[PDB]
Structures are given as structure tokens and as C-alpha cells.
């Protein structure tokens, strides 16, 4: 979280928290209620976000859902949707934490290895997250949307 990050830097330097570090904690805790609201909205609309983004993805990449393609077949298609749901849940965790530590450990470190074994194309998983961003952003107020956007963008960057 914001807390964890601040403390870890202080502990390494063997010191109490700086005024700057304290200020960042203050700002974060003020934002908390707003962050929880953003997360709640996305949680409620989860099924819609995944599905509409999924549809756009299949339109954008017909091949994956084609007999030649990897995603072809209903079971395979379900798994691709399940994956999108997992990634959406991760994003919400990030927003409430105010940092990526939770996201990073659960979903990005070692991600290159796993998908490559499966043969699922990552140069397309990122696109699915982009898709999800567009849908999710439309259910949020402008200020809220921007906050949410950062976390979505981080995921796209990390892949």
C-alpha cells in the first residue's frame, strides 16, 4: 500500500518517517473513502465490464476465437473471460491500496513465463486490459475515472 511503501523506505534508512512520508499518508487516508467508492462501482459492474470488453476483444482479434486460434472453443473462451475477471479484481485491489504492490505480486511478476507456456498471446492480453479500461472508465466520474485509469495503464505497461 502507500503505508507499506513509506515504512519500508524508512526502515531501510533506519529512521522515523519523514514529514514528506507522513504527508503522503495523510493525503492517502483522506482519499480513502473516494477510493473505496471507485472500487465498489467497478465490483458491482464486474460482469458487464468483462463481457463487453470481451466482445470488443473478440471483434478486435477474431483469430484467437477461430478454429486455428488458441482461444477457440467454448471452454477456452470461458477461460479467457475468467482471466479478464481475475485482472479486473486485481485492479480494484490496487485502487484501494493506492499502489501496485498487491497487483504486482499476484498478477505481473512471473506473468511472462506463465502465458508463454500456455501459448496464450500476451501482445493481446494487454489489449484486453485496455478494453476493460474503456468500459470501466465510462461508469466513473471524470476525477474517479482518471484515478482508476492509472491502475489500468500500469497493468498494460507491466505486460
Amino acid at each position: 500500500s502507500v503505508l507499506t511503501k513509506a515504512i519500508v523506505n524508512a526502515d531501510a534508512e533506519a529512521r522515523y518517517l519523514s514529514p514528506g512520508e507522513l504527508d503522503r499518508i495523510k493525503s492517502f487516508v483522506a482519499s480513502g473513502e473516494r477510493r473505496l467508492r471507485i472500487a465498489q462501482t467497478l465490483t458491482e459492474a464486474r460482469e458487464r465490464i468483462v463481457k463487453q470488453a470481451g466482445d470488443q476483444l473478440f471483434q478486435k482479434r477474431p483469430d484467437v476465437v477461430s478454429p486455428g486460434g488458441n482461444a477457440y472453443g467454448e471452454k477456452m473462451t470461458a477461460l479467457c473471460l475468467r482471466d479478464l475477471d481475475y485482472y479486473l479484481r486485481l485492479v480494484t485491489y490496487g485502487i484501494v491500496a493506492g499502489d501496485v504492490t498487491p497487483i504486482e505480486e499476484i498478477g505481473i511478476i512471473g506473468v511472462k513465463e506463465m502465458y508463454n507456456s500456455l501459448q496464450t498471446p500476451i501482445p493481446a492480453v494487454a489489449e484486453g486490459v485496455r478494453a476493460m479500461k474503456n468500459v470501466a472508465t465510462s461508469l466513473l466520474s471524470g476525477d474517479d475515472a482518471a484515478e482508476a485509469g492509472f491502475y489500468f495503464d500500469y497493468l498494460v505497461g507491466a505486460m
Binding site: 463481457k51 477474431p62 476465437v65 473462451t77 473471460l81
Partner: peptide, 26 residues
């Protein structure tokens, strides 16, 4: 079980056929 995904995925496949679109450079 991914049951919700299983029914939604087939619903999506039935509503639209991906096997004709062809990739678009855009």
C-alpha cells in the same frame, strides 16, 4: 466451475460469428 462464464461465453458465440471478420489494421 466458471459456470457464469460457460453460459455467457456460448451466448456470446451464438450471438456473433468471429470466423469472417478478418483482422483490421486500424
Amino acid at each position: 466451475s466458471l459456470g457464469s462464464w460457460l453460459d455467457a461465453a456460448r451466448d456470446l458465440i451464438s450471438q456473433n460469428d468471429y470466423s469472417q471478420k478478418a483482422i483490421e489494421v486500424e
